[PDB]
């Protein structure tokens, strides 16, 4: 690790600076360095880690989608052959994406998840594990595609089981987990009815618990509830 000589606190400080500068590759490298110090992450630090890699992989996913669409049109009936270049470059971006996902999954396996005992940390990391297997699934086509999908499902399911036992229905981590697992069902698992059922039940159970919240917690929960409703509107 090229960050091995930097103080943990300095890595966290620089991750925050990188975020303000919109330098998300740097942010991710700083937070990888912080994880590799071996100490558990606080709530703020977990979110710095997630923000960093979500932005990096989000750019890669967007690029991959553009290139995949160009590749598919180049392979339609009537196209002018334009050589191996589109496939090659889509493959290049795909391999870089897979590398980022493998890096994140490696941090979770070594050793963030096994040391995460509190619900807010363990559910957070298992959601991340589901998310990054889901991104691997988005580009998978080989002997392991079903196994990648089942790895995403298994992580999400363990997270769901803990979240339902240990957090209120308005907890934003619980809500975001359900949002994303619902999308997994719709987009990855070809289970739109499960996707819709999960989003609706999550929304309704959260609605009924809003009365317990402060104004600040209310704002956090209703924000994600609106995303659940947005997806339901898209799907029905």
């Amino acid at each position: 690790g090229a960050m091995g000589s930097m103080e943990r606190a300095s890595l966290i400080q620089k991750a925050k600076l990188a975020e303000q500068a919109e330098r998300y590759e740097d942010m991710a490298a700083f937070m990888k360095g912080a994880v590799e110090k071996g100490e558990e992450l606080s709530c703020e630090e977990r979110n710095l880690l997630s923000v960093a890699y979500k932005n990096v992989v989000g750019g890669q996913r967007a690029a991959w989608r553009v290139l995949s669409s160009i590749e598919q049109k180049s392979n339609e009936e009537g196209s002018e052959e334009k050589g191996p270049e589109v496939r090659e470059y889509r493959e290049k971006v795909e391999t870089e994406l897979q590398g980022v996902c493998d890096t994140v999954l490696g941090l979770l396996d070594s050793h963030l998840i096994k040391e995460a005992g509190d619900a807010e940390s363990r559910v957070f990391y298992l959601k991340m594990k589901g998310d990054y297997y889901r991104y691997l699934a988005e580009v998978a086509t080989g002997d392991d595609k079903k196994r990648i999908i089942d790895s995403a499902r298994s992580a999400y399911q363990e997270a769901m089981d803990i979240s339902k036992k240990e957090m209120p229905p308005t907890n934003p981590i619980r809500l975001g987990l359900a949002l994303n697992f619902s999308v997994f069902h719709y987009e990855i698992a070809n289970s739109p009815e499960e996707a819709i059922s999960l989003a609706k039940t999550t929304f309704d159970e959260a609605m009924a618990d809003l009365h317990t919240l402060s104004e600040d917690s209310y704002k956090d929960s209703t924000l994600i509830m609106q995303l659940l409703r947005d997806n339901l509107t898209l799907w029905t």
Binding site: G176, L179, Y186, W235
Partner: peptide, 5 residues
Amino acid sequence: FPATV
């Protein structure tokens, strides 16, 4: 795309 967080 559908929303994820």
